[PDB]
PDB file of C-alpha atoms (C1' of nucleotides) in Angstrom:
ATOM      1  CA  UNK A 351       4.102 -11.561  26.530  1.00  0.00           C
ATOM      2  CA  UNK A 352       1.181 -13.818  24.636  1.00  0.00           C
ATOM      3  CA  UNK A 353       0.318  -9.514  23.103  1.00  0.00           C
ATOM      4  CA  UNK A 354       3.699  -7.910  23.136  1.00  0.00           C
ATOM      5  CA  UNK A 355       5.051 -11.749  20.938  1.00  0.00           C
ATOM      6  CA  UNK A 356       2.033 -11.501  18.907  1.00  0.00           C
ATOM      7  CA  UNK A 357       3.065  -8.081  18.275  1.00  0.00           C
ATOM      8  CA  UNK A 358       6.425  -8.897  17.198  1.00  0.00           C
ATOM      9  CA  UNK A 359       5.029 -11.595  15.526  1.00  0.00           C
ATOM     10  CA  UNK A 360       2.891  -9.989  13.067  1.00  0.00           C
ATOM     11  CA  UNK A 361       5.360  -7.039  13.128  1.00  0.00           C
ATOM     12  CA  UNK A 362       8.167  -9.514  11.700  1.00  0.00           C
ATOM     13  CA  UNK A 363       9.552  -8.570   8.465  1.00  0.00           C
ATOM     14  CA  UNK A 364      11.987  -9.870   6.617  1.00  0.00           C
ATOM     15  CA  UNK A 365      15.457  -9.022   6.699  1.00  0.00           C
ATOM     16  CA  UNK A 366      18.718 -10.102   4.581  1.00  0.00           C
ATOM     17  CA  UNK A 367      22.082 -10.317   6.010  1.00  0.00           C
ATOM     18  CA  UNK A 368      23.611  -7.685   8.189  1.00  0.00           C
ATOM     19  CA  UNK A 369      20.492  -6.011   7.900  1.00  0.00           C
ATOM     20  CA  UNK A 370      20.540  -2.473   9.983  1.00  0.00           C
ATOM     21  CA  UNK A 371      17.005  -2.928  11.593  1.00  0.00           C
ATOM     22  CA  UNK A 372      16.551  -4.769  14.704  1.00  0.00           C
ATOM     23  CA  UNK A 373      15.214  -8.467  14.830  1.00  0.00           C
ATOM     24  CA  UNK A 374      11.989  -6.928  16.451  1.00  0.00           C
ATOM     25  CA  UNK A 375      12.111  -3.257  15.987  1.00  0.00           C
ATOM     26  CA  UNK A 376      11.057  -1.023  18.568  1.00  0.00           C
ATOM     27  CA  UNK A 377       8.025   0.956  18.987  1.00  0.00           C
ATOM     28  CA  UNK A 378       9.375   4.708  18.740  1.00  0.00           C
ATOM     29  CA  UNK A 379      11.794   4.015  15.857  1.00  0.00           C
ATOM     30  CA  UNK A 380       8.637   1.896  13.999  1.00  0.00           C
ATOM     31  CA  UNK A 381       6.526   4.533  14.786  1.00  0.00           C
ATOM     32  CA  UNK A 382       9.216   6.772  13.647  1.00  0.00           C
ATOM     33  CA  UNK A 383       8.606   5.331  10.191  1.00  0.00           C
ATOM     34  CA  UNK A 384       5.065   6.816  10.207  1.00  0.00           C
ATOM     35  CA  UNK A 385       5.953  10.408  11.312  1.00  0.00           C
ATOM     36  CA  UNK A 386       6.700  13.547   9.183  1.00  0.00           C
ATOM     37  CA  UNK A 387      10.567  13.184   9.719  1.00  0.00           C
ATOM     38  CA  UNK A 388      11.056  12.507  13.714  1.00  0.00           C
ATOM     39  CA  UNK A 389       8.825  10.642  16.232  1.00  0.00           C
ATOM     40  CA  UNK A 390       7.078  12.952  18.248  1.00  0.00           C
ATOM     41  CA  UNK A 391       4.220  14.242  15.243  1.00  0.00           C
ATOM     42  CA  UNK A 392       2.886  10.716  15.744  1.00  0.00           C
ATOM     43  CA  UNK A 393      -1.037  11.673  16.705  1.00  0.00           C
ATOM     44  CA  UNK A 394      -0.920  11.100  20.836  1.00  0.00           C
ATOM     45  CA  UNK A 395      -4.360   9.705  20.412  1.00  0.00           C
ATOM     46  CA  UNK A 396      -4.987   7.523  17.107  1.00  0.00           C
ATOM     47  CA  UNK A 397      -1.068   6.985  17.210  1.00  0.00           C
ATOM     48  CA  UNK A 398       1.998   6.364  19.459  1.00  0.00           C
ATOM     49  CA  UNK A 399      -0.578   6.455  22.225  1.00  0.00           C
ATOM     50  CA  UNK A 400      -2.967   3.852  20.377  1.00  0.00           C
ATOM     51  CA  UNK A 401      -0.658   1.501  18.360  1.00  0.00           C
ATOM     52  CA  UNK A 402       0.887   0.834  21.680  1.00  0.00           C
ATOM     53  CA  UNK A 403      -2.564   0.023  23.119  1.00  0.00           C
ATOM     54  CA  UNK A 404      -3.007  -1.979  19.889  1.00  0.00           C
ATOM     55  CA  UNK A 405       0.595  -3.698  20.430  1.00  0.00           C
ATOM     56  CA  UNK A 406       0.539  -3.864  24.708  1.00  0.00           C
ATOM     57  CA  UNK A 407      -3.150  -5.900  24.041  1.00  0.00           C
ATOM     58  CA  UNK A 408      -3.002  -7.717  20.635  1.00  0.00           C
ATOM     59  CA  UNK A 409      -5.533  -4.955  19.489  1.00  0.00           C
ATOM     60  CA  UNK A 410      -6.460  -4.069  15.895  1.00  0.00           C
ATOM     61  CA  UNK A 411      -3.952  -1.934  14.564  1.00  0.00           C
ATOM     62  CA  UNK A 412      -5.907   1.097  13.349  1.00  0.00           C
ATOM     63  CA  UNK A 413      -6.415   2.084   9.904  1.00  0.00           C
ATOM     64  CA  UNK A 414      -4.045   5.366  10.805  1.00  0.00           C
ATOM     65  CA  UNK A 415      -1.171   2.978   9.929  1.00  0.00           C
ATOM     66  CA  UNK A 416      -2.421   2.129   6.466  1.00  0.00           C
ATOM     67  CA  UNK A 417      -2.897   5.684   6.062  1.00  0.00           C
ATOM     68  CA  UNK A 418      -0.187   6.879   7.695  1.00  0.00           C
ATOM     69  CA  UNK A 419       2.365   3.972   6.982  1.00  0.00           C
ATOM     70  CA  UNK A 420       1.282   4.610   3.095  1.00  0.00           C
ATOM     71  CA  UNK A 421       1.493   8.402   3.966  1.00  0.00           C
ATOM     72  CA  UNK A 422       5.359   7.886   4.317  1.00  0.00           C
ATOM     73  CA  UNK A 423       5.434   4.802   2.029  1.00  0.00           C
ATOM     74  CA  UNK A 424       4.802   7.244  -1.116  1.00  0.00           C
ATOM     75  CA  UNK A 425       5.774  10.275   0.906  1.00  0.00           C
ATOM     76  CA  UNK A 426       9.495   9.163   1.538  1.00  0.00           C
ATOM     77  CA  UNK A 427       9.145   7.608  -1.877  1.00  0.00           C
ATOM     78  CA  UNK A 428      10.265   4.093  -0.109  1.00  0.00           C
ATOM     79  CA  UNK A 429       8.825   1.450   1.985  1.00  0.00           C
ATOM     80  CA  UNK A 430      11.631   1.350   5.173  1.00  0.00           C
ATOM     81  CA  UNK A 431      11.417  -1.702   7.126  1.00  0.00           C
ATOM     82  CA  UNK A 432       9.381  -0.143   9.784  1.00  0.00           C
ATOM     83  CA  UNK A 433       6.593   0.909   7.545  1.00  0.00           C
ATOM     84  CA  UNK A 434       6.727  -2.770   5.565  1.00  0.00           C
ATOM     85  CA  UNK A 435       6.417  -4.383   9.086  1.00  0.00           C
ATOM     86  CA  UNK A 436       4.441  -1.947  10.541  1.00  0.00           C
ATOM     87  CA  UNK A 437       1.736  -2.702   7.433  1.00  0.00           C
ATOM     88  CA  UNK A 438       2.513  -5.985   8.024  1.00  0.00           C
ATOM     89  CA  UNK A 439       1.507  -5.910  11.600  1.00  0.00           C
ATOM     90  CA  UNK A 440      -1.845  -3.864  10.446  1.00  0.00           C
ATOM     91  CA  UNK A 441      -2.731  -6.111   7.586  1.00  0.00           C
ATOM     92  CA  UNK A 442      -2.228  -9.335   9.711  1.00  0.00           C
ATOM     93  CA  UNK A 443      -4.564  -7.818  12.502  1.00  0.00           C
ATOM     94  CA  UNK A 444      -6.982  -6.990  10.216  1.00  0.00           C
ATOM     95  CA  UNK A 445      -7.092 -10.288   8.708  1.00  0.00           C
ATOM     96  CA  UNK A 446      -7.285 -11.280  12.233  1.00  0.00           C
ATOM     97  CA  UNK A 447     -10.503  -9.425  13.222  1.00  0.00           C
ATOM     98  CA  UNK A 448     -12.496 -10.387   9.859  1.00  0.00           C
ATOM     99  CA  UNK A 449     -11.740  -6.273   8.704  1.00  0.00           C
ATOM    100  CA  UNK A 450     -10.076  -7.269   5.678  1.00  0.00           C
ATOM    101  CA  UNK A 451     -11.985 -10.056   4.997  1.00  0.00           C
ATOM    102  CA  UNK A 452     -11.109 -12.200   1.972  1.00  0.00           C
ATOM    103  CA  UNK A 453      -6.768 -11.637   2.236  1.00  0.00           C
ATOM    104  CA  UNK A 454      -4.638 -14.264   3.906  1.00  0.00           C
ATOM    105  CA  UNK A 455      -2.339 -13.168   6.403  1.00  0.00           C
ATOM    106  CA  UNK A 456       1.238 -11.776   5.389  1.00  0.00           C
ATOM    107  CA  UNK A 457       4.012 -13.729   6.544  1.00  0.00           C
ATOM    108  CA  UNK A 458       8.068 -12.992   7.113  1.00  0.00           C
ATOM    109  CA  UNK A 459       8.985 -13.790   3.804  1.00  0.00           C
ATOM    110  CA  UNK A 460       7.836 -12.387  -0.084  1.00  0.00           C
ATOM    111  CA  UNK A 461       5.117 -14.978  -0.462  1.00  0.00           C
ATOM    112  CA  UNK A 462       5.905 -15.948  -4.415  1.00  0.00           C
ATOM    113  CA  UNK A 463       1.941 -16.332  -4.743  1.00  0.00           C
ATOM    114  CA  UNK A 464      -0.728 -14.292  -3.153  1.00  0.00           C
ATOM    115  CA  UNK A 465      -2.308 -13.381  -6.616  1.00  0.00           C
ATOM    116  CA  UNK A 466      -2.993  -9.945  -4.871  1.00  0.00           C
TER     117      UNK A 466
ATOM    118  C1'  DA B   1     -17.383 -27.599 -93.645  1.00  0.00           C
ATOM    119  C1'  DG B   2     -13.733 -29.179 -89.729  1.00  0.00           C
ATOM    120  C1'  DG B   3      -9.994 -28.009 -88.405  1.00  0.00           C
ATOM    121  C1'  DA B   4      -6.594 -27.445 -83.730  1.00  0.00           C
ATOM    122  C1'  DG B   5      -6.107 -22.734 -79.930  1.00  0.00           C
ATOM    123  C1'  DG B   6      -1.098 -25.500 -75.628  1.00  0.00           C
ATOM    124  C1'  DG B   7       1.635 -29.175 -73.889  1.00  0.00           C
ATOM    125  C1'  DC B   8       5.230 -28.365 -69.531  1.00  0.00           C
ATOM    126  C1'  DG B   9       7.581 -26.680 -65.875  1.00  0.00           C
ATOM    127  C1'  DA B  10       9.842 -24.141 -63.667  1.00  0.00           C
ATOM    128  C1'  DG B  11       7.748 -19.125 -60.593  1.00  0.00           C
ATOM    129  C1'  DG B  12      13.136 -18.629 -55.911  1.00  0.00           C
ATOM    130  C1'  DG B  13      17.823 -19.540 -54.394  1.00  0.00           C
ATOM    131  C1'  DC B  14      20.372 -16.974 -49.800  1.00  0.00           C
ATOM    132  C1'  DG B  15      21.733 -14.434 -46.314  1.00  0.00           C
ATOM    133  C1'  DA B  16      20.802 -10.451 -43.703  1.00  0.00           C
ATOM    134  C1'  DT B  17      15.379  -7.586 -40.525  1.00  0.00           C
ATOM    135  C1'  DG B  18      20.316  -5.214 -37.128  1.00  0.00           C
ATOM    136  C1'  DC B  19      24.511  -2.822 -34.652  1.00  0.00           C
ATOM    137  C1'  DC B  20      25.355   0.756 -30.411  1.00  0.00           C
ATOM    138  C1'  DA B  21      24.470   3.551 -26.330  1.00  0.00           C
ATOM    139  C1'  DC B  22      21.045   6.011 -23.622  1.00  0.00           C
ATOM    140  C1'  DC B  23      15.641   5.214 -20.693  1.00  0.00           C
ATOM    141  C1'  DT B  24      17.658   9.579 -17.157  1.00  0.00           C
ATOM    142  C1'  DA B  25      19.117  14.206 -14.566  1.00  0.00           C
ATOM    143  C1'  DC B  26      17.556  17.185  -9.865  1.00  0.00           C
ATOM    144  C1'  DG B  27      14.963  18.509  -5.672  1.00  0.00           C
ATOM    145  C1'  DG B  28      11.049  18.913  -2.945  1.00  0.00           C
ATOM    146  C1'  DC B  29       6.413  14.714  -0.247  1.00  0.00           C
ATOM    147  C1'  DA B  30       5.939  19.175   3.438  1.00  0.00           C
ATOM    148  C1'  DA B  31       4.198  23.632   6.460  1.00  0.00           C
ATOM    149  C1'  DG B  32       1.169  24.410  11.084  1.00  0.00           C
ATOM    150  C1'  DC B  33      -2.195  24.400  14.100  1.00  0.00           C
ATOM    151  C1'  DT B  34      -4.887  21.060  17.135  1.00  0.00           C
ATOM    152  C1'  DG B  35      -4.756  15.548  19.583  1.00  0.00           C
ATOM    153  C1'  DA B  36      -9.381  18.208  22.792  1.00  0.00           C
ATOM    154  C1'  DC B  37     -13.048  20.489  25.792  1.00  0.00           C
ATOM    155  C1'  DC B  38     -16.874  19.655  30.325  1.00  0.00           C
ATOM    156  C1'  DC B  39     -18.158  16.439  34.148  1.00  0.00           C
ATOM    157  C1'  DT B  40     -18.159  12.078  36.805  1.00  0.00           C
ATOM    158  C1'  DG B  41     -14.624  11.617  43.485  1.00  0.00           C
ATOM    159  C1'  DA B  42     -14.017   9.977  48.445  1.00  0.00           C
ATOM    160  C1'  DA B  43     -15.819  11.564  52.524  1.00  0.00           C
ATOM    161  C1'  DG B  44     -17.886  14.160  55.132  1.00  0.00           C
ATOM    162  C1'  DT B  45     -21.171  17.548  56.612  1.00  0.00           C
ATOM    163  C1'  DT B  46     -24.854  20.605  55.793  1.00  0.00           C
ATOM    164  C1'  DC B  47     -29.244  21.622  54.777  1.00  0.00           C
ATOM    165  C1'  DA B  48     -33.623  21.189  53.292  1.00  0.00           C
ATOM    166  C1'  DT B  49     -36.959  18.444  53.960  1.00  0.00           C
ATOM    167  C1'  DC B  50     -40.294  14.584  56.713  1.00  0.00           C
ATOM    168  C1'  DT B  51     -42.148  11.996  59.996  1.00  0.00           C
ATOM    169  C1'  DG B  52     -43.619  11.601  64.021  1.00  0.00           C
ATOM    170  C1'  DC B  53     -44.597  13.767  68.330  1.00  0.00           C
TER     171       DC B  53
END
DNA sequence: AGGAGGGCGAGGGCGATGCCACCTACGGCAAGCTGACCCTGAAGTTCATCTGC
């Protein structure tokens, strides 16, 4: 579990009370958050078919989330939980690998700071 | 000629410099396609070739 809980680790997001999204929220409906309306557009090779390779194995996230998480972020006009954790989940990875080298890694909560 | 040419002290006092609401409506953020070709196998035999006879 040491990849799927670091998944769901830097995939954690906060939520408020009686918040509609699950406590860790799955794959196809997070992924769902990146595709044009429904989750099957989700590129079979850079996509569903890699994230979960980057989730199943602690993997970088690749930078199709960032584009396509922002795709939907300013595509639906909002950022759904599921695109703010999934971005979450990226940006903590690539802090993680030394790809997005002078950020500090998210966290759960609004960090009041991170002058970024 | 030798004059004296102002001396004085005031030059704001008072309050007000906003009230009211509005800062959006609406809808769309996609469509459509592709996401790969090709091979590379085990296992066995054949078959062409070589060495030795």
């Amino acid at each position: 579990s040491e990849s799927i809980a670091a998944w769901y680790d830097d995939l954690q997001m906060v939520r408020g009370e009686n918040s509609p999204y699950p406590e860790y929220m799955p794959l196809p409906r997070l992924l769902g958050n990146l595709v044009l309306d429904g989750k099957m557009e989700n590129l079979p090779s850079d996509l569903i078919a890699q994230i979960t390779d980057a989730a199943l194995n602690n993997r970088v996230l690749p930078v199709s989330l960032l584009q396509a998480a922002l795709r939907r972020n300013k595509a639906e006009q909002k950022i759904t939980y599921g695109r703010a954790s999934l971005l979450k989940a990226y940006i903590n990875r690539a802090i993680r690998a030394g790809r997005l080298k002078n950020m500090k890694e998210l966290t759960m909560g609004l960090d009041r700071n991170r002058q970024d």
